[PDB]
Amino acid sequence: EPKLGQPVEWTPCRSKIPGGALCGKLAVPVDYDRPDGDVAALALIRFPATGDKIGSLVINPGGPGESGIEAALGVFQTLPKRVHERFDLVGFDPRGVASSRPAIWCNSDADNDRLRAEPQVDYSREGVAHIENETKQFVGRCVDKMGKNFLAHVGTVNVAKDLDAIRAALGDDKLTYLGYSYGTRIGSAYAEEFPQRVRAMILDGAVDPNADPIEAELRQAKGFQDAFNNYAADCAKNAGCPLGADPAKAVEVYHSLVDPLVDPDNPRISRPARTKDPRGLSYSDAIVGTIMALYSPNLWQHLTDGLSELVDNRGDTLLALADMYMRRDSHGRYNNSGDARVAINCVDQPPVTDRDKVIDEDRRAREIAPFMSYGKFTGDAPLGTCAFWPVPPTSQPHAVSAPGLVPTVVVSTTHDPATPYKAGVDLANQLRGSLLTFDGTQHTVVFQGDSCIDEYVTAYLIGGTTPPSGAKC
Numbered sequence: 469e470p471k472l473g474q475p476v477e478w479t480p481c482r483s484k485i486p487g488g489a490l491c492g493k494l495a496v497p498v499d500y501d502r503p504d505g506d507v508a509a510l511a512l513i514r515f516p517a518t519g520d521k522i523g524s525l526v527i528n529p530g531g532p533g534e535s536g537i538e539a540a541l542g543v544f545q546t547l548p549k550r551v552h553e554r555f556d557l558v559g560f561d562p563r564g565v566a567s568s569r570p571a572i573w574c575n576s577d578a579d580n581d582r583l584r585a586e587p588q589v590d591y592s593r594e595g596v597a598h599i600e601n602e603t604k605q606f607v608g609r610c611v612d613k614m615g616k617n618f619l620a621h622v623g624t625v626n627v628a629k630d631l632d633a634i635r636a637a638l639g640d641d642k643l644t645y646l647g648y649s650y651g652t653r654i655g656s657a658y659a660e661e662f663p664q665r666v667r668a669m670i671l672d673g674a675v676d677p678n679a680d681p682i683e684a685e686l687r688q689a690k691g692f693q694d695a696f697n698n699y700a701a702d703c704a705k706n707a708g709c710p711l712g713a714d715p716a717k718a719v720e721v722y723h724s725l726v727d728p729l730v731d732p733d734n735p736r737i738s739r740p741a742r743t744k745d746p747r748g749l750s751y752s753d754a755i756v757g758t759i760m761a762l763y764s765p766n767l768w769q770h771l772t773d774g775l776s777e778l779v780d781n782r783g784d785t786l787l788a789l790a791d792m793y794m795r796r797d798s799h800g801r802y803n804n805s806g807d808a809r810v811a812i813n814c815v816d817q818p819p820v821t822d823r824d825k826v827i828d829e830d831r832r833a834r835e836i837a838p839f840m841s842y843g844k845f846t847g848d849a850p851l852g853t854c855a856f857w858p859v860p861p862t863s864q865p866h867a868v869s870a871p872g873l874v875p876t877v878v879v880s881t882t883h884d885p886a887t888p889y890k891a892g893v894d895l896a897n898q899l900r901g902s903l904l905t906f907d908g909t910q911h912t913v914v915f916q917g918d919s920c921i922d923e924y925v926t927a928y929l930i931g932g933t934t935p936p937s938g939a940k941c
């Protein structure tokens with residue numbers, strides 16, 4: 469095990485790994501107010517630079533709960549040549565995530581499978597009570613396996629402190645950071661606590677820390693409905709579209725394909741589409757699979773395949789897309805990204821506990837994103853998991869305040885479903901940095917094949933040149 473204050477012991481990484489990758493662990497205190505107490509071990513991966521090294525480019529894929537080691541292995545394949553020359557590509561698993569120890573675990577593989585088999589559409593009083601009873605048992609499993617102390621200190625406020633310890637452990641006087649999705653919350657949290665330690669920062673797919681949680685969720689529901697509409701309009705131009713040639717009826721045709729997966733007389737009964745997998749395709753997995761495909765047009769073909777299969781009451785592709793979102797491998801084993809996502813989210817802001825607010829949010833969500841709403845508004849809706857969380861939040865919604873921060877770049881995609889375009893405009897305003905706009909219907913874009921975007925962030929990472937005002941790719 470690594471000890472507090474000890475240098476990172478690098479070694480060639482485990483089971484082929486490219487680019488002479490080095491792996492190691494850094495010890496951080498669980499509670500920064502008690503560095504004498506318990507210690508967490510953060511897993512790191514490192515791809516040494518091939519040319520004149522400026523420093524380390526630390527990345528985070530977001531989630532929260534997504535592995536940064538896994539992400540750095542993917543980014544290494546699409547890393548521009550000049551970035552690979554001047555920077556060590558460094559990924560890290562945040563505290564409680566993936567290979568970091570202790571890792572957040574709440575649900576067994578069967579607990580996740582059992583939930584996904586349920587339609588999760590019954591919002592009657594009995595249905596809401598059933599959902600909240602499962603939620604209370606989920607929270608109990610988190611406490612039993614993790615303990616309240618570690619769950620209390622897993623928030624982004626402590627990840628930002630870990631990120632500075634990572635910067636010093638990597639030998640960099642200042643941090644060069646690329647954050648995707650939730651990684652932009654790590655970025656802004658780090659920018660507020662260590663503004664004097666930021667050399668460069670790129671935030672792709674922005675979350676606004678000043679946002680109200682309800683309105684942000686409804687803006688994300690609108691983003692996924694807009695992405696659904698863009699996918700359906702594209703499919704309508706193509707031969708044999710399973711949603712028909714009229715995009716104005718695509719939501720109706722979509723529901724004619726997914727609604728039969730629920731028993732029309734008993735919303736608690738699943739009628740799953742046939743798959744080679746023994747699970748079949750539940751309604752909830754069909755919706756999750758659709759959401760997964762709407763993250764990128766590279767998956768739109770898979771959504772079309774999944775819906776054509778549903779015409780014949782098959783659900784193999786949509787089940788695979790749902791497995792991709794939930795990170796369930798071919799042997800039925802989940803990674804801890806799902807459980808880590810909940811535990812990190814529940815401490816990053818005060819949860820919504822008002823019943824009227826939760827009910828009214830479901831009423832508006834049904835109207836805003838009809839594609840992922842079943843049946844009619846019932847007058848009731850379940851509270852989220854965080855409303856039952858046993859440890860208090862360690863961050864509060866606020867506008868990012870880092871006055872002396874170096875110019876940064878926020879990359880925002882016009883029709884991003886997961887983090888809408890306006891969220892990136894608002895974050896760039898709070899950071900008082902540059903906004904780089906990408907025109908598309910996808911979530912994140914940096915280092916993913918677009919030379920316009922990549923040449924912008926390459927010049928920023930190396931020379932500090934920010935894109936001009938109104939830059940579009």
Ligand SMILES: *[C@](O)(C(=O)OC)[C@H](C[C@@H]1CC=NC1=O)NC(=O)[C@H](CCCCN)NC(=O)[C@H](Cc1ccccc1)NC(=O)O
Binds near residue numbers: 534759794805
């Ligand atoms: C970003 O971190 C990402 O894409 O991670 C890979 C992103 C950022 C969040 C969006 C709003 N605030 C954030 O912090 N996270 C996500 O998109 C997560 C993780 C994806 C799963 C990968 N294993 N999921 C959602 O945000 C989710 C999307 C959704 C909408 C409607 C139905 C079902 C899912 N929405 C949610 O948690 O409310």
